[PDB]
Amino acid sequence: ASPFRLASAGEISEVQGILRTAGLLGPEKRIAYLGVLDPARGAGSEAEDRRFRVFIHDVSGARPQEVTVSVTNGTVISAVELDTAATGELPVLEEEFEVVEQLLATDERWLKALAARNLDVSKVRVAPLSAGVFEYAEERGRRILRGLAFVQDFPEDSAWAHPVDGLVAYVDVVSKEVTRVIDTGVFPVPAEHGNYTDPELTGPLRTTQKPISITQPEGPSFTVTGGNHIEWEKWSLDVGFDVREGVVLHNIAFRDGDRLRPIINRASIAEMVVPYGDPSPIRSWQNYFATGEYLVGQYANSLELGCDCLGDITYLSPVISDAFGNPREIRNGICMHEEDWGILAKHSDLWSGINYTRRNRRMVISFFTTIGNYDYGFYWYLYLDGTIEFEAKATGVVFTSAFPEGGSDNISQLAPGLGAPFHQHIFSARLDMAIDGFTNRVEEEDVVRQTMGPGNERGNAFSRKRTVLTRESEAVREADARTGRTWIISNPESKNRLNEPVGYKLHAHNQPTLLADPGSSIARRAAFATKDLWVTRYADDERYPTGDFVNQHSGGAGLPSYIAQDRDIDGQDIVVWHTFGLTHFPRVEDWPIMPVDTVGFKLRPEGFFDRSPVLDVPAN
Amino acid sequence: ASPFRLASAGEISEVQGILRTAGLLGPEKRIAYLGVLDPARGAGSEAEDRRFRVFIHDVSGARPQEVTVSVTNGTVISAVELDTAATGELPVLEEEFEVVEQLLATDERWLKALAARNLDVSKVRVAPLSAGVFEYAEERGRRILRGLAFVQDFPEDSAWAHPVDGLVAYVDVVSKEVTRVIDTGVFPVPAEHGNYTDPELTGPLRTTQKPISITQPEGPSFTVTGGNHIEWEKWSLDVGFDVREGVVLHNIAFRDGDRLRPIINRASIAEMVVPYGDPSPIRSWQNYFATGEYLVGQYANSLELGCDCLGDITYLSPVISDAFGNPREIRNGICMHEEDWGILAKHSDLWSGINYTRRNRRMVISFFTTIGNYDYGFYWYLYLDGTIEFEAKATGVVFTSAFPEGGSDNISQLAPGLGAPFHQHIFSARLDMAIDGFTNRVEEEDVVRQTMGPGNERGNAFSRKRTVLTRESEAVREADARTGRTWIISNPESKNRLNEPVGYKLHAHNQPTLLADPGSSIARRAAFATKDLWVTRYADDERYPTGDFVNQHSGGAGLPSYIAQDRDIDGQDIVVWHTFGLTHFPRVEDWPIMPVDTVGFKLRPEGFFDRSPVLDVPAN
């Protein structure tokens, strides 16, 4: 009966029925987004009213709508007509992926471009990329997708090995017309194939790898109740799933003695964008918001035991809605398991003669998604010592282009004539904090060097300083690796036995943030990505760092708009938004399929406990 | 027959015999350091001549000597008398540890200080700390150790919980004299105990942890031949061990097709220092060079199966010399095993319909050492994809002090009246490079942001630049996380199939470097720690960033002196010295025994291979 339970297939079908009966789901309508709404602040309202938020698209051109329904009472709470030119277009539909290639296949301009390159139209795949907002005035208010071509020689061929450069087209997916076809010139289509399962490329397979058996004879140490409530080594939380954000962690708390102490109310990857840095007009508009525009959760893969998740795994199979309101299950889309994590603590004392060693462990909650050529793994880890960590694993196939004759300062060569445009993968972790409760504050902590002189005659002293962020206008911070800058979230009203406010310290990887010029469209639409850390006052409707309707929005939505309210965040219900990402200059080693690369962050207890919380761990 | 084989007990006995025969090892002599010399460059000597280098201390006060012998020819190649007042004192002997407490036990000044604090001398442990170089004129030419006191209530009591602040003494361990006893005032000695094995503090042990079974039915995938030659998943290397540096990796190479391609000739942690940032006269002189002053390899722990190393482990038991030249085996001092490392590569393609997933693995080579209150784990990892990584794990018990009533800017409070002085743990990895051979060069790579305008009208472009470090004078570099700065070691004479010099990219963690004032004694003695990366031209006698003799040695040797030669490093035999470390502001969670914290670096192939090197990994 948990208010945080995963949505059932029945609830989805109930939303469908409510919408249809209300006359909001005609033949021309499509569900572009559907998700359950979290419980509002305050549980004083016995029996939670299960509500769902829905974005309804109209393939007829009619205005779309945002609808909220109660599956509990079978009613439509609200239905608001959207003006996309003002607030943004709805997320891209999977069924729209094919329309780009299909429409172009009958366009004379496109056909002429392909004929000139001697490419059989039946073998040309077209990637349906988001449009963004640029200098095309005729696109405002229109639902546009841009297409880039790749050649697939045969059904099982990897089209990514054969990009068709110097060509790009724009299509209005609703009116079903090709608005523009740009051909800047012919570029040879890379000839080598990139079929990583082809023996001629892989060569003889290795026979040297001996098996590694990971098992748990007595089963896992964690328990799963209510379908998604996890309890493991003092940790307690609920594993939620949203079609847009993917896996979401709720009510992260730690059992310290006789009390369950909250740490984070809600943790999620609220956005992830991949901005490309190639100035060619064929790709200079390319910026794909995996989360906001495509909805990464809907493309979650079914994870195979022994391949994707090794060991004793407990799966969760979330249900989402298809474009028509029918429930669709993502079988084994979420993996949960615990794993050994080396040494936790160790000391051999010369005076006491006592030799002490203890092992560490981590609870893993993960899912893997695929968006076109990219595949991303999202991993959340809980450690015995109280540490919380997130790790993203980027793999898949690199987005390609031709490698220019004469070289390039924005593309790397991965194969003869094959290029890989420079780009970044930037994530935004939204952490609705609740350190021992909702009354929290954030302090920026910098290392402080000291000058040799009075009080520091030997010049060995060094210190640290903490600055409380009191208002949102001063809560947009940048990293500073050189001064070991971190951010501490504490509760000024809850102190440890040393009379110090309890807290948690966020450690960032300090990777570069958005590189695009400050005046670029992407810098405006993905403003969150320009700074490492933002702190806002909690608000029900402030869900994503980029706003609710990212697709084709002019910019400034999300964080920049939230921060503009300049609200008090000193000892209040606050939310931390951490930006982190990878800057990718593709290597030859990334081709034909790339080895996983990683990025993330972690939070470690900072005077949260009265002493080490792992003194009760056995020797085993 | 391998000239990279581990030293044998016989070789050590042979060195002892040769030294004795030469009249260099009488009863007053002690072996402060003994290690095998790596073979010189180029296949000079027809056969391999095994040579050892030794530092001989004299307990009577006579001048020590540095000697090199050939165990093969039974001869002394060279023996030089050392002027310690100039070139530095020899490493501290384990037998000198107890000397400090013993001498102070009968000193009236020391006894009076303890009496003033109502402390029973029989229960006062004294830590033998390195002295460094400060303003004490009498210390010139004297072998000094400074002592800090801790109370041990009973045999198995953790003395670290009871520091005796406001008191420090200096001792000449050779003349057996207490040179000075400094008492700045009586501080309350913290009363709470820190016995992490006492049920009173641990409380009832958890019974919730289920077992995790990690086994290899068919044994490990790696082979060990010639005692220390490792071959695993295309990797080839020799595992060496030196009493000073600990585990050292030799001839790291990768089998690419039909050729064994070298990558790194020698990899080691050539120094590690722990500088304290408390300006109190009681500890302002404290800087412990675990590697250079104490010799970390000497204190390597015997690792227990199931506790220290889990899974199918292959052990190495290196042999070192004791203070008299007799061989001593460190049973199971080195652990070697392979472990699963999640997903290696993955892609589910929407056009080919092919779903592909491969798992990763890494070879692990490690050891764990203990120096007083600290315990450090040194880990080297080799990945299937060609990545090489080092990870240091810091744990043990924090060095304590009293926590001043009025608070402190350089000490944190761990328990009532118990303090933990701020400090850093800084390592120096010496990487004698050999990317496809010895003709190498280093380039500093920075991300390059571009301004919106002609050629970049949309302001989305971003690039990078590489700067070749041509001479040592320009090879002292700093990190720049903001611009994603990395360093690439390449071979200008060996190109991949795309006609680009093969290379490897070093990724640093970009943690703060030495914080001490540039004019401090430690900034001079640990000069290497003030910069993130140094590149030198290979030279036989340039082994450590701090020189051969660190104990009580001023600046003047090491990296700063090496770089002064301003040698050509552009396409030459070069060595990369990377500084990396942790800045520790102790938390309550670190008491009474600290959870492991980590730091390290890694190098990934950068155009070294002609495509991904793991296409031949099987699905199962």
Ligand SMILES: [Cu+2]
């Ligand atoms: Cu990428």
Ligand SMILES: [Cu+2]
């Ligand atoms: Cu420390």
